[PDB]
Every structure is written in structure tokens, then in C-alpha cells.
Design a protein around this ligand. Structure first.
Ligand SMILES: [K+]
Ligand SMILES: [K+]
Ligand SMILES: [Mg+2]
Ligand SMILES: [Mg+2]
Ligand SMILES: [Mg+2]
Ligand SMILES: [Mg+2]
Ligand SMILES: [Mg+2]
Ligand SMILES: [Mg+2]
Ligand SMILES: [Mg+2]
Ligand SMILES: [Mg+2]
Ligand SMILES: [Mg+2]
Ligand SMILES: [Mg+2]
Ligand SMILES: [Mg+2]
Lengths: 182, 149, 129, 152, 86
RNA sequence: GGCAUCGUUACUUUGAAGAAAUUAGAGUGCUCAAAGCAAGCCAUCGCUCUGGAUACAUUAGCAUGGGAUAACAUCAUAGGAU
RNA sequence: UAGGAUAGGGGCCUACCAUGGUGGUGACGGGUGACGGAGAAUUAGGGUUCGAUUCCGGAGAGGGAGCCUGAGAAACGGCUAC
């Protein structure tokens, strides 16, 4: 459901009804929808038009959704159009350990190591093959990401949606690109 | 360069940037775990288990498919050897050198190599003691070393 | 062995600058190297530079604009207070009109004028002018 | 028992033969009771000093010695003695001409009460007291075993 | 080829790095690959490493496929080679 | 006014305590100066509460803030946290 | 550990017990035409050399030792001995 409290927003109702509805209409996707549905759903319009929706698998159901993320969003195409639905995973970001504070806060799931841990979630069907960081003269560093050339799908027009989503989820400017070779 | 030579060779491996296992790998974690455990039962060792997995069973890198190193997998399963592999092979080489040098007292070049290998053995043993990978009472006794291997 | 990556970075950059190169490659990268380069770029002594992720230690490609005369580290990192900065200025710098000394104070990595502004001290990383 | 000498060992001013009961009488050491005190300075009296049978007049917790002066941390150097250890205090001396530090050390003999179990290389915290011997002027106040402070 | 003043280190030519040492490339990459060797008969799915070190066999007749050498494994003349990739 | 119980240091900032004399330094026309800590003024049965400033003073010690750069052990039999 | 002695802590001394204590981070031993410090000379900075002497602390009254009186001395412009 959601991390704290009992009453979520007014937006999750549409996605919950879509979850309860979309199962009826598939053969394999129908069966494997007994997992915890969502934790939050947030809308965010991108520059110009074609607003986007961001959903949060808790943590553990992320691996099963990689098996359906290829179809689910496509199956979610026959839904509230004007959508760019993207799934991420909610993660703890514990800063706590101070100068003392012998607590270790494992160096795997640190703070802002989640930042690059949500980055490939937004682009799950296309795995990143390269990353560069350019530090501009105004202190306005940008991140350029080379995704795998095997696009073969709608990953081409989601780049600005990914940029807006990352800007509103981590406060970083990211511009995507593709290799010239293949 | 080399610790005990003047060489400057740089030949090594180059792991791919893509940390995820390749798509064509259709082997589950359970099969890899069972294969590693069976190999460790057959007296193999992590370095020579990784190569067997890479060649025969088409597993490019264990840390990718299973998410953890071979030594960690064996230690979690409890099949890990009592002595680290590199120290074991260094001790084996030193034992072979001593066995050969016993009958050739004038071969004053294998004595120098023996000194070098004993120095490497002692350095590695000190490191493994510092990280509690060996008992603090461990000691390399040359006469009884061959019984260990 | 590589005991100070900052010295290797600064020395390679200075050597490339003397030869009139327009780009230089620095390997391996690190956060302190990035902060030193950021200070130098902010004061207008270099231009663009991009960090390349090689998944192991990262490289930096830096664009030179010909404005950098010398840049070099100071080893070991001596500790200087606010009252000693002047003395080091009389040693590492051509004149009081320009030049910069980089300090790693507990408020971050900065130049010596900024350290005097904030009235803080620290260790000396290097210098550039 | 704790009596291993040719004289009976007892805590001073602690009457050991009162007929009236105990275990509820304030100031432990009244009507027959182990006498113990808190040394202050934010130090915790060990349970082995309150519920103990040893007798030590030089112990800071159950003795006649009061801790005042300087508090010094260090590492145990040699503990081959009878209720006394050597504490090694490592520091850095600043050679001014060369603006550089040289490693220095200084051994300090300290008295360790029978409530503290110690080993070579342990991390000890000691506090200055009145002279107890020719060289002993400190009492061990805390012992942390080597290779510790774990948990995350 | 005056010097790197004309080329761009950020975007170097895509073929010159096909020849440099793997460590010395802009981003380190392996020079090997995996191949599914197909025998003359059936059982054509066996997967082998390019720079293999163990003499692999086949379920049918053990059909010795490759010999380990100082570099790429010496595939036999009778065994057909095609490569699998990411 | 609360109320805890805490990785340790180096480094850096701010504070305190810090003998005078000497040194630097403010005032002051000993006729100048080296000096001295005196003096100055309405032309008084006196006044300026006259002044007799201020720094620095390694290192070690005490206390406040900072955590960038460094050193120690702490790091997966859960003997972990709630 | 227990006493003795002291104005008082303490191998300061006695009886018994244990085998410890310091050292290439220089113990131990030797040289000093070595009292220590505040300070002095020269000083771009760093530094080098000096510091018996009037301010602070210590030690001595030809060389050692013992002591009375006294609140305070192992006093010497006090005693006793060599
Ligand atoms: K006494
Ligand atoms: K009198
Ligand atoms: Mg006594
Ligand atoms: Mg005796
Ligand atoms: Mg003399
Ligand atoms: Mg003098
Ligand atoms: Mg005279
Ligand atoms: Mg005098
Ligand atoms: Mg006298
Ligand atoms: Mg005379
Ligand atoms: Mg006399
Ligand atoms: Mg006379
Ligand atoms: Mg006299």
C-alpha cells in the first residue's frame, strides 16, 4: 500500500483500478498479479506536453516486474492516454553516521548511491553501456548516458521524459544519447 | 613491477563494463550454486572452479549470475578450504623446492629462489593474520610444512 | 608506486600545457582532483572538462585555453593557519597581484583568498598561476 | 579465599561482626558490607567491584585512593606483575626547524584493580592518584579489549 | 597526424580503438567472446570460450572441439563456429 | 531549567589562563636624542574621574565550533538494530 | 602484603613473597672550557651562536659529615668532629 499512515492520495485510485482491471484480458499477465500493487503514484508533466506517471515497487517485487515491464506498460497503453508510466523502487537513504557513530550504513545502499540505483530503473528495457559527467563553466555539470544501441522500441521519444523524471527525482540534469557504431 | 623480479609485464584480464550477465545465459542461480558446491566437493579451488564454469558451462562471470564471489559462496555453504588458495600454492611450491634442493646442495640458484618464495609466504601469512583469516598461532614450519600439503 | 594521484594529474596537465596541447587526459580521477580542477576553472585558468566513468577509477579529459602558466602540488600537505597564508603567498606565488594557493580546509577545498574571507585554515594542496 | 597473606585483609572502618542485618543499609560498608564508591568523572563502577570478594586498598572503587589530576589514555605494554601494568602513551613531537613530526612514546606504570581483566595490547584509560609506589602514580579506570567496538 | 590537437579525446575514432591494448582503450573492454560450436552431426549447441583453456568434449562421440593454445583455442577443421553475443 | 549516552586523535577557528623587565607599539617638546613614565591647563587656596594604552609570547596543557585532508581498530558464524 | 619512620604519600627503611623494570622512538655509559629560564647578537623569511652577572627558580659558604635552637636551617657574619 503505502509506507506510513492509512489514507493515500487521490491519484493512486486510477492505478489501483487499472491493476485490478488489466489482469482480465491477458493469459500470463493475468496470473502473476498477486504481488503488492503499488506504494505511490506521482504525475509530472514534461516540457510542452505528454505528461508522465511514476510508480514505486516496494523493493522485492522489482525483479518480477522486470519479467512483465516489457508488456505491462504496453498493456497499460490502453489506459489513460497521454501517459509515460515508469516504475522505480523505493529505497532507504540513511545518512545518519556522523564523525563518531560507529554504525556503518553499508557502502552498497548508501545515500546518493540510490541516485544511480534509480537511474537504470527508469530505462530498464535498455541497459546503460556508458556514462560521462561534463562540468560546465557555470558550475552546471551535466550527465550524458550512452544506452545500448538496441532500441527497437519506444525508448527513443522517452528521453526528455527521463530527463524531467530525473530532474524531479534527484535534482540532476541528464541528457541521453546512443552510440554511433551500431 | 614484479615484487621479486625486474619484469614490468601488464598482461591481465579486462572485465566488461556491463555488470549484468549476458542475455543468452539461461542458467538459474540454483544450478550454478550446485555446480560450485559439487566442484568444491571434488577437491577443486575457486580459481580453477571459475575457469571450469567459464569453459564447460558457459558462465562468463560468477559474480554476475549469482551476485556474489566464489569464495563467499563456498564460505556461506561452509565448504571453504581451511587455508587460502594462494598461500596453499605458495607452500606447495616451497615444499617442492625444498624436496629438490635436499639432494642438490650445489644448486645455489634454487636456494635463492627458495629464499624468495619463503619471503612471499611470510608476507602473505602476515597479511592473513592481520585480517583474522588464519589462527593467530599459525606459523610456517619448513620441516612439517610438507605434511600440510 | 602511485602515492599521490593529484601530483600525477597536475604534472600531466602542466606538461601538456607547455607543449601547446588543447586537451589532456588524467588517470585515475578522484574527488580532490575534481575539486582542484573546479577551483581552477572557476577562477578562469582552464575550460571544459568531463569525467569518464570506466567503472574502476574514472578518467578526466580537460580542455586547455592557454592561460595556465604553472600548476603544481605541495608535498607533504603542510598545515597552515590564517596568519601563515601571507608567508606561503610570498613563497609559492609570482606577485601579490594574482596567483592562487589551494587549501583543503574543513569547509572544503578552496583558494587562499576565500579562506581569508571565511577566516579558516587548513592544509595546502597545491598552487596555480 | 581472598586471604592469601599472613595477615587478615579487611576493608577499613567496615565492621564485619555486627549482629544486626544488612542489605538495605545506605553507604555500602555499613553493618557489614563491601565498601565501594564511584570515582566520578563519568566512570561506571564495574559489577565485579561491587559484587566482589577481593581486597585491594589501592583499588580506586573499593579502596582508600581517590582519582584526581590528569586522565590519560593509552595501550597496555606489559602486564607481568601483581596488580600493576605498563601503559604505552604514543604521541608526536613537533621538530620545529623541519616542520615535521617524529613518533615518541612514554611508559607509565599504573595500578590495575582485581576487578579488571587485562591483556597485552588492550586499550586502557587511567587517572592520576597519590603515589602508590616508587613509580606508580596512576590507577586503571577502564579497559577495552583489543579488537573491539563492533556492531552496526 | 600533428598531434591530438586535431582529434578529440572525448570522441576518438571508432576504429583506432579496435587496435589499441584493451587496458589502454578509453574504457577497458575484453577482446574475447563466446561461441556456440556446431559439430558435423547433432548436438550443435555447446558453448565455448574463445580463449578457452580446457579441451571441451561433446555428448555424442566426445568430438574434440578445441585445443588450448597461447591465444584463441584451436578449433578443429571439422567443427563449425558461430558466435553468440549480448 | 529539562533528558539522556557517545569512536579516538592529528589539523584548523575562537576563548581562557597566562610575571615584570627586554622587543614591537599609542600618548607625552626631558631645549633635541639615547631616555623617563611623565605630565597638561585657567594663571586656581584648583581642575583634566589626568595618563601610567595594545600586541606577540613556539611546543605541552584546558574549553567552543568545523570535518575537507590524514592515522587506529572496528566490517558476514549475526553474539546486529527496533 | 604488614609494619617502622616522617608533617605527610612513597622501597623512604624492615620481614616475607613474586621476577620483574628501561632500551636503535638511543636505555646504560662518556664529554661539556654545562647552573636552568626570562633573554642577547645577527637577522627577507627560515636560521646560527651565546645566555657567570642586577628579574624568577636551584645549589654553595675551603672539602665532606653530624646536629642544637627555632614556626621556619641539616644555617656556617651557629655549634661538634675529621
Ligand atoms: K611518608
Ligand atoms: K622564633
Ligand atoms: Mg606504608
Ligand atoms: Mg628488604
Ligand atoms: Mg660548571
Ligand atoms: Mg643564567
Ligand atoms: Mg659580579
Ligand atoms: Mg638568583
Ligand atoms: Mg645552604
Ligand atoms: Mg675561598
Ligand atoms: Mg654547614
Ligand atoms: Mg663571611
Ligand atoms: Mg649566610
Amino acid at each position: 500500500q503505502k509506507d506510513k499512515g492509512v489514507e493515500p492520495s487521490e491519484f493512486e485510485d486510477t492505478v489501483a483500478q487499472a491493476f485490478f482491471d488489466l489482469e482480465n484480458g491477458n493469459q500470463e499477465l493475468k496470473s502473476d498479479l498477486k504481488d503488492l500493487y503499488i506504494n505511490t503514484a506521482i504525475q509530472m508533466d514534461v516540457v510542452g506536453n505528454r505528461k508522465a506517471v511514476v510508480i514505486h515497487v516496494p523493493y522485492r517485487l522489482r525483479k518480477p516486474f522486470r519479467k512483465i515491464h516489457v508488456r505491462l506498460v504496453r498493456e497499460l497503453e490502453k489506459k489513460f492516454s497521454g501517459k509515460d508510466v515508469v516504475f522505480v523502487a523505493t529505497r532507504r537513504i540513511v545518512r545518519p553516521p556522523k564523525k563518531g557513530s560507529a554504525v556503518q550504513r553499508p557502502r552498497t545502499r548508501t545515500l546518493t548511491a540510490v541516485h544511480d540505483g534509480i537511474l537504470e530503473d527508469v530505462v530498464y528495457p535498455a541497459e546503460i553501456v556508458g556514462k560521462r559527467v561534463r562540468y560546465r563553466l557555470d558550475g552546471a555539470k551535466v550527465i550524458k548516458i550512452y544506452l545500448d544501441p538496441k532500441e527497437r522500441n519506444n525508448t527513443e521519444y522517452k528521453l526528455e521524459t527521463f530527463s524531467a523524471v530525473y530532474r524531479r527525482l534527484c535534482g540532476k540534469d541528464v541528457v541521453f544519447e546512443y552510440p554511433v557504431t551500431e | 613491477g614484479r615484487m621479486h623480479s625486474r619484469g614490468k609485464g601488464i598482461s591481465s584480464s579486462a572485465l566488461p563494463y556491463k555488470r549484468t550477465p549476458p542475455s543468452w545465459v539461461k542458467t538459474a542461480v540454483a544450478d550454478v550454486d550446485e555446480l560450485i558446491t559439487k566442484a568444491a566437493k571434488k577437491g577443486q579451488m575457486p580459481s580453477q572452479i571459475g575457469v571450469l564454469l567459464r569453459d564447460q558451462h558457459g558462465i562468463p562471470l560468477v559474480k554476475s549470475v549469482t551476485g556474489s564471489k566464489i569464495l563467499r559462496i563456498l564460505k556461506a555453504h561452509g565448504l571453504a578450504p581451511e587455508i587460502p588458495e594462494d598461500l596453499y600454492f605458495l607452500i606447495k611450491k616451497a615444499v617442492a623446492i625444498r624436496k629438490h634442493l635436499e639432494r642438490n646442495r650445489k644448486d645455489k640458484d634454487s636456494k635463492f629462489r627458495l629464499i624468495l618464495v619463503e619471503s612471499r609466504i611470510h608476507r602473505l601469512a602476515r597479511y592473513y593474520k592481520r585480517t583474522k583469516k588464519l589462527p593467530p598461532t599459525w606459523k610456517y614450519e619448513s620441516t612439517t610444512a610438507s605434511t600440510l600439503v | 608506486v602511485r602515492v599521490s594521484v593529484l601530483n600525477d594529474a597536475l604534472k600531466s596537465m602542466y606538461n601538456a600545457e607547455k607543449r601547446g596541447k588543447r586537451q589532456v587526459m588524467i588517470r585515475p580521477s578522484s574527488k580532490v582532483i575534481i575539486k582542484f580542477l573546479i577551483v581552477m576553472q572557476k577562477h578562469g585558468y582552464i575550460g571544459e572538462f568531463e569525467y569518464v566513468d570506466d567503472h574502476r577509477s574514472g578518467k578526466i579529459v580537460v580542455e586547455l585555453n592557454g592561460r595556465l602558466n604553472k600548476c603544481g602540488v605541495i608535498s607533504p600537505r603542510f598545515d597552515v593557519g590564517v596568519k601563515e597564508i601571507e608567508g606561503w603567498t610570498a613563497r609559492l606565488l609570482p606577485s601579490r597581484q594574482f596567483g592562487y594557493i589551494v587549501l583543503t580546509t574543513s569547509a572544503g577545498i578552496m583558494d587562499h583568498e576565500e579562506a581569508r574571507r571565511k577566516n579558516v585554515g587548513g592544509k595546502v594542496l597545491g598552487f596555480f598561476y | 579465599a581472598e586471604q592469601t597473606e599472613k595477615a587478615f585483609l579487611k576493608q577499613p572502618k567496615v565492621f564485619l561482626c555486627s549482629k544486626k542485618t544488612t542489605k538495605g543499609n545506605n553507604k555500602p560498608g555499613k553493618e557489614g558490607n563491601r565498601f565501594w564508591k564511584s570515582v566520578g568523572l563519568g566512570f561506571k563502577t564495574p559489577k565485579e567491584a561491587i559484587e566482589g570478594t577481593y581486597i585491594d586498598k589501592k583499588c580506586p572503587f573499593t579502596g582508600t585512593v581517590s582519582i584526581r589530576g590528569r586522565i590519560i589514555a593509552g595501550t597496555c605494554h606489559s602486564a607481568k606483575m601483581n596488580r600493576t601494568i605498563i601503559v604505552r602513551r604514543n604521541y608526536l613531537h613537533y621538530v620545529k626547524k623541519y616542520q615535521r613530526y617524529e613518533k615518541r612514546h612514554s611508559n607509565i606504570p599504573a595500578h590495575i584493580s582485581p576487578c579488571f581483566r587485562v591483556r597485552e595490547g588492550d586499550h586502557v584509560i587511567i587517572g592520576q592518584c597519590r603515589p602508590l609506589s616508587k613509580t606508580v602514580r596512576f590507577n586503571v579506570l577502564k579497559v577495552v579489549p583489543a579488537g573491539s567496538k563492533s556492531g552496526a | 597526424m600533428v598531434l591530438q590537437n586535431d582529434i578529440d579525446l572525448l570522441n576518438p575514432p571508432a576504429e583506432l580503438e579496435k587496435l589499441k591494448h584493451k587496458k589502454k582503450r578509453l574504457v577497458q573492454s575484453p577482446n574475447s567472446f563466446f561461441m556456440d560450436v556446431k559439430c558435423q552431426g547433432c548436438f550443435n549447441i555447446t558453448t565455448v570460450f574463445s580463449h578457452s583453456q580446457t579441451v571441451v568434449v561433446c555428448p555424442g562421440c566426445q568430438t574434440v572441439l578445441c585445443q588450448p593454445t597461447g591465444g584463441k583455442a584451436r578449433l578443429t577443421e571439422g567443427c563449425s563456429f558461430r558466435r553468440k553475443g549480448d
